[PDB]
């Protein structure tokens, strides 16, 4: 965490960078400091460009503005201002640290216009600006991949070797891929800018009166908003200073229940908003209403703005965050060896210098396929089309590969695992001092007062809507209710008072006037006559509240006079029901050892009840609640574990999560290893948990749906959103259907791509390597394949097999075994090496057999490589290799358990049959395609049969080798050095806890 400030020289840096033509890689390589050191022209006090190390390197421009001089710079969305008192840069969010609550109250009156302008210059606009970049900026940024440079180099070489057509094909593929990539990245950025964009007309008072109306962009910390009496979105973070409000903080917690926010308690002591969260209004949370009760209107002082807000922090984290397929040493050394051999043999076979350089250069492109990434991505396009045919839409197809190697899934509770709302579980009538049994549906009850109160008392508020829907009494004196008995009309009513949570309604029917009161259990019970209220109201209430349910008391009297004397008629209990398809999906994931986690902003009781109900915690598995008391400053923090009714499971809280992260880093891995429920998580805490789990060498996905869990979706390896707005922007995947079933299906698809990818990769490597050998063989005798032969190997054979081996789909079920997670694994390397030993054996045997014939005459090596054709050695080697490409393409691909069996994709097998038919025709049928392809038309039938026998030997050898390797290599590996002790951090932690569970 250090920095420095740098101040004609740009022209020299530009010339040196442009002249080198590769120094950008060196600057982009491990040593980038020199590139900045020369260009920046090296103090902090006096600078025009700043560099910071994060102990990592980052470069920023020292922006400036006039007020009468200001110097500021942005970094990770956070602004910093230069201060002359200490001659250093300071984060603006800490400019006023530990402000007293009385100091906040002193700004009850607004902010002077001069103070508004100067303070706006300090903090900046209230908007959250997404720096959308122009097409060249994205190009230099997200399309600097060195493989594209290698592709361009190969293209230029091929145009320098008259190999126009394949160069054109690669150019079209690469250009189209680059253009689509740039377009979609810009589209995502534009959509993000739109999502985070906010615009409102907000009233702000002034010490000179006449409360003005301004844009949201003008707010600065220190003026106060006049919150509207009706409601609307909150432009920024603020602290209530006068009045009370009801807010909808579904953007932070994920629940839509109204939340009461009261005025800030005046006094000394700093205002943090971590302990004054009940008196502060956060950005984005929807205000249901604001009632003052004192003075002419509700007042809330601004505290944070722009990126400083909680939403600002979340968006900042969102903005600012196979792999082994790019192994370098082996391919580089092998290409180098082949090159030096080529120059040696070529100078041994006298040919011109320009030809020698071109030939030596082309072997590297033969070794490394420039078409490899396109072959890799075909299967991801197949998987994307498959998913889009069934709801799920993806933006980055290569991310689908991560679904194959996913091993941990986090789930939001509200909306994702459970319905996005509450539903009636039943009404609980009580006659004397004993509740009658809970009724499943309230329809089946007498025509007594209780049903009438269930049908009439309401503000007609999803809660009352659900009440009236279940009882079924249709609406039509403020109303007249029809049962599906008597028509009951509402004679009088009262508003639902926000302070005292009571709601009374007086009704009468053709058959005395009677009042019904709906309210909270304890308060209404206190209002009622203890004669009717039962003794065990406290235990029946802890029984429901502790189980995550929400109870409502109904009282009545046959008619201050109305809300006085009351008697309880019953209790209505509500629950956030599990969606009908979560338990099968959760158990399906669990039986394959895919860990399911709950990560909720809800309370802990509802979270644990839902976790037990849906099957994340089996009835036989233990479960422990870990609680961490805050450091009192007299004694340090200490963890305390409370078991419950009963693989171990841990239920961590929100503040306790932060406490464990801060004061117990050493014990955090153990908790994360066996934690299943995470309640009261802040939007940033979800991302923190995801990042920590990823640090434990996991591949974590999450299936959130709401706005609160967006940073976690961005941070997760495989994020899925169950909502077409507020979360599809960041998620790589989005499902039209809203339930957990998208998670398993995605995994299955991912496994195919992670399996298909391996096979495709294997073929391409082989494709390349065998070709390299063949080229070398001909180069040993001053000969080359030929332009048409090269084209018939690169265009038709590779494209057909590569695209057609990716059609296969999953096996409709999830097995217990994951696919291999690494292309550099022992099985992959062994398979390629053994397959090449076989292929080289067959090719060399064919070459050494064709020399021992009565009818063979060697080529004359005095002529160039392409002018030696048609030629006996070339046609023999080409005939063998052409079949070998198909043999390997067929043998490499696999079926079960991650894909359908290899005989299902009839197009691929039919393509192989036609390609093999034309190839055997080329070998046997004389002079039909041997004009274009310079072949010498072997006349001896017996030798042709021997060639056919050799390629059949290659066929049977490759298939038997793949079968025996797959069915007997794990046994040999395990039987040797059985002490595996896998290096992944989470597996190691499981072993330490398994031998000795640390929490006794
Ligand atoms: C020239 C270098 C070759 C490659 C070296 C790579 C290291 C190597 O072999 O892995 C250890 C293997 C087995 O390991 P291997 O199959 O190669 O893969 C490893 C483990 O299997 C591990 O899984 P588990 O521990 O089973 O959970 C996990 O899959 C990791 O790969 P991932 O990234 O795909 O997740 C690797 O750490 O152990 C033997 O089975 C005896 C072989 C002895 C032969 C010695 C080879 C020199
Ligand atoms: C594999 C090898 C051959 C790499 C080839 C890369 C090309 C695909 C790149 C090189 C130059 C790029 C172009 C550079 C500049 C522009 C200008 C741009 O138009 C503008 O000038 C306005 C842009 C703006 O105002 O945002 C449209 C995209 C385009 C044609 C780019 C599209 C992609 C191109 C053709
Ligand atoms: C000339 C050279 C550069 C070769 C180019 C090959 C293309 C013609 C290939 C590459 C990607 C292929 C596509 C990859 C994936 C699909 C998804 C596939 O969808 C499915 O069949 C699964 C969905 C379902 O059936 O449920 C339909 C064909 C299509 C569009 C393929 C059509 C042929 C494409 C365009
Ligand atoms: C100069 C001579 C050698 C002409 C070569 C022409 C090539 C450019 C042609 C020959 C065979 C063609 C291929 C034959 C069959 C297919 C299958 C086709 O399959 C699908 O469309 C998807 C099938 C599915 O999704 O089920 C995609 C195009 C492709 C690879 C064709 C792409 C263009 C190829 C390689
Ligand atoms: C040898 C056989 C050749 C087969 C030829 C036919 C297949 C041609 C497919 C070309 C790839 C087109 O597909 C496009 O490719 C680019 C990179 O490859 C991907 O780009 C990838 O990286 C960029 C960042 O670098 C991400 O923003 C993007 O999400 C990711 O998928 C695009 O998301 C994918 O949509
Ligand atoms: C031995 C002699 C003949 C070989 C010369 C081949 C040279 C020109 C080749 C080999 C590898 C190639 C480089 C591979 C990677 C990159 C990264 C890219 O971001 C800039 C281009 C650059 C730097 C390529 C330019 C051309 C290149 C340097
Ligand atoms: C001059 C000598 C080294 C010969 C040139 C060998 C070339 C072909 C070597 C040198 C460095 C190599 C690159 C190093 C890094 C990567 C990783 C990833 O981005 C794709 C492969 C890629 C891009 C390699 C491909 C092969 C490569 C380009
Ligand atoms: C015969 C010679 C000139 C080759 C020309 C092949 C052309 C038609 C190829 C090159 C790259 C290909 C595209 C690559 C990417 C995609 C995205 C996929 O989601 C739909 C198909 C689509 C849009 C392909 C269609 C066919 C395509 C445009
Ligand atoms: C038709 C003439 C030219 C010969 C070429 C036919 C080849 C490509 C075809 C014929 C039938 C095919 C086989 C049919 C059934 C199976 C079982 C399955 O586990 C995949 C491998 C295997 C063994 C197939 C491999 C490809 C195959 C051998
Ligand atoms: C190889 O080179 C010459 C070029 O004319 C060709 O005619 C002849 O077949 C070969 N030379 C000899 C001496 O055989
Ligand atoms: C299986 C691949 C067969 C390749 C066929 C090549 C056909 C080339 C057309 C003729 C071009 C040259 C004629 C002068
Ligand atoms: N798989 C990429 C290798 C492509 N090699 C093509 C070489 C073409 C040589 N043509 C020589 C033409 C002489 N005028
Ligand atoms: C677009 C793929 C190339 C097909 C056209 C070229 C055919 C080869 C011509 C060779 C002339 C010697
Ligand atoms: C000829 C190159 C353009 C092919 C079409 C590109 C994508 C179309 C998406 C509808
Ligand atoms: C130059 C050909 C451009 C084809 C891609 C344009 C985008 C298509 C809609 C995604
Ligand atoms: C080659 C031009 C066509 C590419 C788009 C094909 C889409 C087919 C959807 C089934
Ligand atoms: C060139 C004619 C063959 C194209 C493929 C036909 C469709 C097969 C997959 C359904
Ligand atoms: C040219 C290779 C593709 C041939 C496909 C034939 C159709 C098979 C589906 C019945
Ligand atoms: C794809 C491998 C094809 C092998 C052909 C063998 C010739 C069979 C006809 C006798
Ligand atoms: C010498 C008579 C030919 C024997 C050739 C053996 C290969 C048989 C391929 C069917
Ligand atoms: C159970 C998998 C059987 C695969 C047999 C492959 C050998 C093919 C002989 C033609
Ligand atoms: Mg939610």
Is the CB of 378 inside a 6 Å radius of any atom of ligand 3? yes
What are the tokens at 109?
């009156």
Provide the Cα torsion 238, 243, 244, 245; round to 10°: -60
**Contact by Cβ (8 Å): 7, 47:** yes
Task: Provide the 3-class DSSP secondary structure of residue 988.
Answer: helix
Q: At what angle do helices 583-590 and 604-614 cross, to 10 degrees?
A: 70
Q: In 3D, which of 749, 106, 676 has the Cα closest to residue 391?
A: 749
- What is the C-alpha separation between 944 and 937, in angstroms, rounded? 10
- What is the C-alpha separation between 418 and 423, in angstroms, rounded? 11
In angstroms and rounded to an integer, the radius of gyration of the C-alpha atoms of the chain is 37
Residue of 763, 880, 955, 957 with the most ligand 19 atoms within 8 Å of its CB, for mutation: 955
- What is the C-alpha separation between 314 and 986, in angstroms, rounded? 28
- What is the C-alpha separation between 568 and 556, in angstroms, rounded? 7
**Contact by Cβ (8 Å): 393, 733:** yes
Q: In 3D, which of 391, 232, 208, 235 has the Cα closest to residue 302?
A: 235
What's the gap between Cα 11 and its chain centre?
42
Is the CB of 286 inside a 6 Å radius of any atom of ligand 19? no
Q: In 3D, which of 896, 737, 929 has the Cα closest to residue 811?
A: 896
Tell me which residue has tokens 């050695």. 873
- What is the C-alpha separation between 170 and 159, in angstroms, rounded? 12
- Does residue 606 lie within any of the structural domains? yes
Q: Are residues 671 and 615 in the same domain?
A: yes
Which residue's alpha carbon is at the smallest distance from atom 5 of ligand 15?
180
- What is the C-alpha separation between 307 and 320, in angstroms, rounded? 12
For residue 163, the ligand closest to its alpha carbon is: 12
Residues flanking ligand 5, CB < 6 Å: 142, 173, 177, 180-181, 185, 371, 373-375, 377-378, 396-398, 798-799, 802
Pairing of strands 624-628, 650-652: parallel
| Edge-to-edge strands, sheet with 624-628 | 393-394, 733-734, 718-721, 700-702, 408-411, 595-599, 675-678, 650-652, 624-628, 639-643
- What is the C-alpha separation between 489 and 452, in angstroms, rounded? 10
Is the CB of 358 inside a 6 Å radius of any atom of ligand 19? no
What's the gap between Cα 768 and its chain centre?
34
CA 248-249-251 angle, to 5 degrees, is: 120
- What is the C-alpha separation between 671 and 550, in angstroms, rounded? 30
Q: Phi/psi class of residue 257: alpha, beta or left (left: φ > 0; alpha: ψ in -120 to 50)?
A: beta
CA 144-150-156 angle, to 5 degrees, is: 115
- What is the C-alpha separation between 61 and 317, in angstroms, rounded? 21
Query: For 414, which DSSP code?
Result: B
Residues sharing a CB contact under 8 Å with residue 737, sequence separation 6 or more, in sequence order: 391
Residue 963 CB neighbour total at 10 angstroms: 11
- What is the C-alpha separation between 962 and 831, in angstroms, rounded? 7
Q: In 3D, which of 780, 825, 845, 844 has the Cα closest to residue 966?
A: 825
Residue of 797, 906, 916, 918 with the most ligand 18 atoms within 8 Å of its CB, for mutation: 906
What distance in angstroms lies between residue 914's CA and the mean position of ligand 18's atoms?
A: 10
The H or E element spanning position 878 is helix 872-892
| Edge-to-edge strands, sheet with 488-493 | 423-429, 567-575, 550-558, 514-519, 502-508, 488-493, 480-481
Residues sharing a CB contact under 8 Å with residue 967, sequence separation 6 or more, in sequence order: none
Q: Are residues 485 and 508 in the same domain?
A: yes
- What is the C-alpha separation between 455 and 467, in angstroms, rounded? 7
709 annotated as ligand-binding: yes
Q: In 3D, which of 156, 161, 154 has the Cα closest to residue 356?
A: 161
**Contact by Cβ (8 Å): 720, 733:** yes
Exposed/middle/buried for residue 152 (C-beta within 10 Å: 0-12, 13-18, 19+): middle
Q: Are residues 462 and 529 in the same domain?
A: yes
**Contact by Cβ (8 Å): 162, 105:** no
Task: Provide the 3-class DSSP secondary structure of residue 835.
Answer: helix
Q: In 3D, which of 401, 743, 742, 817 has the Cα closest to residue 591?
A: 817
Residues flanking ligand 9, CB < 6 Å: 890, 895, 901-903, 909, 912-913, 916-917
- What is the C-alpha separation between 630 and 210, in angstroms, rounded? 46
Whichever domain contains 295, its CATH number is: 2.70.150.10
- Does residue 443 lie within any of the structural domains? no
Would residue 412 show up in a list of annotated catalytic residues for this protein?
yes
Q: Are residues 165 and 270 in the same domain?
A: no
What distance in angstroms lies between residue 240's CA and the mean position of ligand 4's atoms?
A: 68
Q: Is the dihedral of CA 760, 761, 762, 763 positive or negative?
A: positive
Q: Are residues 690 and 806 in the same domain?
A: no
In the PDB record, what is the listed experimental method?
A: cryo-EM
State the catalytic residue, choosing from 237, 362, 412, 787: 412
- For residue 733, what are the β-bridge partners? 394, 720
Domain span holding position 534? 450-575
Task: Provide the 3-class DSSP secondary structure of residue 256.
Answer: coil
- Does residue 858 lie within any of the structural domains? yes
Provide the Cα torsion 921, 927, 928, 929; round to 10°: 90
The H or E element spanning position 627 is strand 624-628
- What is the C-alpha separation between 50 and 5, in angstroms, rounded? 5
705 annotated as ligand-binding: yes
Tell me which residue has tokens 């349910």. 549
Give the residue from 517, 546, 575 where a domain finishes: 575
Task: Provide the 3-class DSSP secondary structure of residue 625.
Answer: strand
What's the gap between Cα 400 and its chain centre?
11
Per DSSP, the residues of 325-375 read GG--HHHHHHHHHHHHHHHHHHHHS---HHHHHHHHHHHHHHHS-TTHHHH
Print the SS3 string covering 141-188.
HHCCCHHHHHHHHHHHHHHCCCCHHHHHHHHHHHHHHHHHHHHHHHHH
CA 776-777-779 angle, to 5 degrees, is: 60
* Nearest ligand 9 atom, CA 916: 3
Q: Kindly report the backbone phi and psi dihedral angles of residue 698, in degrees, each rounded to the nearest multiple of 5, phi listed first.
A: -105, 165
- What is the C-alpha separation between 769 and 749, in angstroms, rounded? 30
Tell me which residue has tokens 């603006």. 92
Query: How many residues are there in the chain?
Result: 1000
Give the residue from 319, 352, 378 where a domain finishes: 319
Q: Are residues 699 and 762 in the same domain?
A: no
Is the CB of 165 inside a 6 Å radius of any atom of ligand 21? no
- Alpha helices by DSSP H, 85-163: 101-106, 113-123, 135-142, 146-159
- What is the C-alpha separation between 282 and 233, in angstroms, rounded? 10
- Does residue 923 lie within any of the structural domains? yes
**Contact by Cβ (8 Å): 439, 427:** yes
Q: Are residues 304 and 288 in the same domain?
A: yes
Q: Are residues 766 and 914 in the same domain?
A: yes
Task: Provide the 3-class DSSP secondary structure of residue 700.
Answer: strand
Residue 956 CB neighbour total at 10 angstroms: 11
- What is the C-alpha separation between 755 and 757, in angstroms, rounded? 5
The H or E element spanning position 63 is strand 63-65
- What is the C-alpha separation between 100 and 106, in angstroms, rounded? 10
Pairing of strands 567-575, 550-558: antiparallel
- What is the C-alpha separation between 883 and 873, in angstroms, rounded? 16
- For residue 259, what are the β-bridge partners? 247
What distance in angstroms lies between residue 770's CA and the mean position of ligand 1's atoms?
A: 26
Q: Are residues 803 and 945 in the same domain?
A: yes
Q: Kindly report the backbone phi and psi dihedral angles of residue 515, in degrees, each rounded to the nearest multiple of 5, phi listed first.
A: -105, 140
- Does residue 478 lie within any of the structural domains? yes
Which residue's alpha carbon is at the smallest distance from atom 21 of ligand 8?
381
Question: Would you give the end-to-end CA distance of the chain in angstroms?
Answer: 40
Is the CB of 381 inside a 6 Å radius of any atom of ligand 8? yes
What are the tokens at 613?
């109900």
Per DSSP, the residues of 529-597 read -TTTS-TTHHHHHHHHHTTT-EEEEEEEEE---SSSSBEEEEEEEEE-PBPSSSHHHHHHHHTTT-EEE
Residues sharing a CB contact under 8 Å with residue 680, sequence separation 6 or more, in sequence order: 600, 601, 602, 603, 604, 653, 654, 655, 657
What's the gap between Cα 601 and its chain centre?
19
Burial per residue of 31-66, b for 16 or more beta-carbon CB atoms within 10 angstroms, e otherwise:
eeeebbebbbeeeeeebebbbbeeeeeeeeebeeee
Resolution value in angstroms: 3.0
Q: Is the dihedral of CA 758, 759, 764, 766 positive or negative?
A: positive
- What is the C-alpha separation between 792 and 734, in angstroms, rounded? 41
What are the tokens at 592?
């394959």
Give the residue from 195, 214, 235 where a domain finishes: 195
Q: Kindly report the backbone phi and psi dihedral angles of residue 626, in degrees, each rounded to the nearest multiple of 5, phi listed first.
A: -95, 125
- For residue 88, what are the β-bridge partners? 83
Q: After which residues is the chain broken (C to N over 2.5 A)?
A: 7, 42, 55, 67, 321, 460, 476, 484, 511, 559, 646
Q: In 3D, which of 821, 768, 839, 798 has the Cα closest to residue 331?
A: 768
Exposed/middle/buried for residue 117 (C-beta within 10 Å: 0-12, 13-18, 19+): middle
**Contact by Cβ (8 Å): 403, 720:** no
- Does residue 73 lie within any of the structural domains? no
- What is the C-alpha separation between 761 and 752, in angstroms, rounded? 14
- What is the C-alpha separation between 935 and 880, in angstroms, rounded? 13
Q: Phi/psi class of residue 87: alpha, beta or left (left: φ > 0; alpha: ψ in -120 to 50)?
A: left
Q: Are residues 797 and 914 in the same domain?
A: yes
The H or E element spanning position 408 is strand 408-411
Per DSSP, the residues of 945-974 read HHHHHHHHHHHHHHHHHHHHHHHHHHHHHH
Whichever domain contains 637, its CATH number is: 3.40.50.1000
Measure Cα distances from 605 to 120, 549, 602, 680, 707 in Å: 44, 9, 8, 11, 22
Task: Provide the 3-class DSSP secondary structure of residue 681.
Answer: coil
Residue 600 CB neighbour total at 10 angstroms: 30
Residues sharing a CB contact under 8 Å with residue 240, sequence separation 6 or more, in sequence order: 261, 262, 263, 264, 279, 280, 281, 298, 299, 300
Is the CB of 179 inside a 6 Å radius of any atom of ligand 15? yes
Instruction: HSE, CB side, 13 Å, CA atoms: give it for residue 581.
Output: 8
**Contact by Cβ (8 Å): 565, 599:** no
The H or E element spanning position 47 is none
Provide the Cα torsion 335, 339, 342, 347; round to 10°: -170
What's the gap between Cα 487 and its chain centre?
55
Which residue's alpha carbon is at the smallest distance from atom 12 of ligand 11?
932
Number of domains in the chain: 6
Q: Are residues 139 and 210 in the same domain?
A: no
**Contact by Cβ (8 Å): 136, 197:** no
Query: For 836, which DSSP code?
Result: H
Burial per residue of 964-977, b for 16 or more beta-carbon CB atoms within 10 angstroms, e otherwise:
ebeeeeeeeeeeee
What distance in angstroms lies between residue 931's CA and the mean position of ligand 16's atoms?
A: 35
- For residue 281, what are the β-bridge partners? 238
Which residue's alpha carbon is at the smallest distance from atom 19 of ligand 8?
381
Task: Give Dmax (Cα) for the chain.
Answer: 123
Whichever domain contains 910, its CATH number is: 1.20.1110.10
- What is the C-alpha separation between 307 and 705, in angstroms, rounded? 23
- Does residue 27 lie within any of the structural domains? no
- Does residue 167 lie within any of the structural domains? yes
- What is the C-alpha separation between 916 and 927, in angstroms, rounded? 17
Measure Cα distances from 604 to 193, 332, 411 in Å: 35, 56, 15
Q: Are residues 612 and 496 in the same domain?
A: no
What distance in angstroms lies between residue 761's CA and the mean position of ligand 1's atoms?
A: 19
CA 283-285-290 angle, to 5 degrees, is: 105
């Amino acid at each position: 965490v250090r920095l420095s400030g740098y101040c004609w020289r740009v022209i020299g840096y530009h010339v040196v960078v442009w002249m080198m033509a590769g120094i950008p890689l060196l600057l982009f390589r491990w040593k980038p400091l020199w590139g900045v050191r020369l260009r920046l022209r090296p103090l902090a006090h006096a600078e025009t460009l700043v560099i910071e190390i994060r102990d990592q390197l980052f470069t920023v421009q020292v922006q400036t503005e006039a007020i009468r001089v200001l110097r500021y710079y942005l970094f990770q969305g956070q602004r910093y201002i230069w201060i002359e008192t200490q001659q250093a840069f300071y984060q603006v969010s800490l400019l006023d640290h530990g402000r007293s609550c009385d100091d906040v109250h002193r700004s009850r009156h607004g902010l002077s216009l001069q103070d508004q302008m100067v303070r706006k210059a300090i903090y900046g606009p209230n908007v959250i600006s997404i720096p959308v970049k122009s097409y060249p900026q994205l190009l230099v940024d997200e399309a600097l991949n060195p493989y594209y440079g290698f592709q361009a180099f190969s293209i230029a070489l091929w145009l320098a070797d008259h190999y126009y057509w394949y160069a054109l094909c690669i150019f079209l593929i690469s250009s189209i891929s680059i253009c689509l990539s740039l377009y979609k990245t810009r589209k995502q950025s534009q959509t993000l800018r739109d999502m985070v964009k906010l615009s409102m007309r907000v009233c702000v008072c002034r010490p000179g009166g006449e409360e003005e109306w301004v844009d949201s962009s003008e707010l600065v910390p220190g003026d106060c908003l006049v919150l509207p009496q009706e409601g609307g979105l909150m432009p920024c973070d603020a602290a209530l200073v006068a009045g009370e409000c009801m807010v909808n903080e579904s953007s932070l917690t994920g629940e839509s229940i109204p939340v009461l926010k009261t005025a800030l308690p005046e006094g000394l002591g700093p205002y943090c908003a971590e302990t004054h969260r009940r008196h502060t209004l956060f950005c984005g949370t929807l205000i249901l209403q604001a009632r003052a009760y004192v003075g002419p209107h509700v007042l809330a002082v601004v505290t944070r703005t722009g990126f400083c807000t909680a939403k600002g922090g979340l968006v900042s984290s969102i903005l600012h965050p196979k792999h082994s397929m790019k192994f370098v040493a082996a391919l580089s050394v092998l290409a180098l060896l082949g090159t030096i051999y080529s120059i040696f043999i070529l100078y041994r076979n006298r040919v011109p210098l320009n030809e020698i350089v071109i030939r030596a250069l082309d072997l590297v492109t033969v070794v490394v396929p420039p078409a490899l990434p396109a072959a890799m991505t075909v299967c991801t396009l197949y998987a994307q089309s498959r998913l889009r045919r069934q709801g799920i839409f993806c933006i980055h197809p290569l991310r689908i590969n991560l679904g194959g190697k996913l091993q941990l899934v986090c789930f939001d509770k509200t909306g994702t695992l459970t319905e996005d709302g509450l539903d009636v579980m039943g009404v609980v009538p009580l006659k004397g001092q004993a509740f009658l049994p809970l009724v499943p549906e309230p329809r089946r009850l007498p025509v007594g007062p209780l049903l009438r109160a269930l049908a009439t008392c309401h503000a007609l508020d999803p809660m009352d809507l659900k009440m009236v829907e279940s009882t079924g009494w249709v609406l039509e004196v403020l109303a007249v209710m029809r049962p599906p008995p008597v028509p009951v009309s509402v004679l009088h009513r009262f508003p639902f008072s926000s302070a005292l949570q009571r709601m009374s309604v007086v009704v009468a029917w053709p058959g005395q006037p009677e009042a019904y009161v709906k309210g909270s259990p304890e308060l209404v019970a206190g209002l009622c006559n203890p004669e009717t209220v039962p003794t065990d109201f406290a235990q029946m209430l802890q029984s429901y509240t502790a189980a995550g349910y929400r109870v409502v008391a109904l009282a009545s009297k046959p008619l201050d006079t109305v809300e006085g004397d009351l008697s309880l008629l019953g209790l209505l209990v509500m629950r956030n029901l599990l969606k009908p398809q979560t338990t099968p999906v959760i158990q399906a994931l669990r039986r394959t050892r895919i860990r399911a986690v709950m990560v909720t902003g809800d309370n802990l009781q509802t979270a644990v009840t839902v976790a037990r109900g849906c099957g994340m915690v089996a009835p036989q598995e233990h479960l422990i609640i870990v609680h961490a008391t805050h450091p009192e400053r007299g004694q340090p923090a200490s963890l305390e574990f409370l078991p419950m009714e009963s693989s171990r499971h841990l239920a961590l809280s929100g503040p306790t999560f932060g406490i464990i992260v801060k004061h117990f880093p050493k014990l955090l891995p153990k908790v994360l290893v066996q934690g299943t429920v995470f309640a009261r998580m802040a939007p940033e805490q979800k991302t923190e948990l995801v990042c920590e789990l990823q640090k434990l060498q996991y591949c974590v996905g999450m299936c959130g749906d709401g706005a609160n869990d967006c940073g976690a979706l961005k941070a997760a390896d495989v994020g899925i959103s169950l909502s077409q707005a507020e979360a599809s922007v960041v998620s790589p995947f989005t499902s039209s259907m809203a339930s957990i079933e998208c998670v398993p299906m995605v995994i299955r698809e991912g496994r195919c791509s992670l399996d298909t990818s391996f096979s495709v990769f294997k073929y391409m490597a082989l494709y390349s390597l065998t070709q390299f050998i063949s080229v070398l063989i001909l180069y040993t005798i001053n000969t080359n394949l030929g332009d048409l032969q090269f084209l018939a190997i690169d265009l038709v054979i590779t494209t057909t097999v590569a695209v057609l081996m990716s059609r296969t789909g999953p096996a409709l079920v999830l097995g217990r075994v994951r696919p291999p997670g690494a292309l550099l694994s022992v099985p992959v390397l062994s398979s390629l090496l053994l397959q090449m030993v076989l292929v080289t054996g067959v090719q060399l045997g064919g070459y050494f057999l064709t020399l021992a014939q009565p009818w063979f005459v060697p080529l004359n090596r005095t002529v160039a490589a392409p002018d030696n054709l048609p030629n006996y050695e070339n046609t023999v080697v080409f005939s063998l290799s052409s079949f070998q490409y198909l043999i390997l393409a067929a043998a490499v691909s696999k079926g079960a358990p991650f894909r359908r069996p290899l005989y299902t994709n009839v197009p691929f097998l039919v393509a192989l049959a036609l390609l093999s038919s034309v190839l055997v025709g080329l070998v046997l049928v004389p002079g039909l395609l041997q004009g274009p392809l310079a072949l010498r038309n072997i006349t001896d039938t017996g030798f042709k049969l021997l060639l056919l026998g050799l390629v059949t030997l290659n066929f049977v050898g490759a298939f038997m080798l793949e079968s025996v390797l797959d069915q007997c290599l794990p046994a040999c590996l395990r039987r040797l050095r059985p002490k595996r002790a896998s290096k992944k951090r989470f597996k190691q932690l499981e072993r330490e806890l398994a031998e000795q569970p640390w929490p006794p």
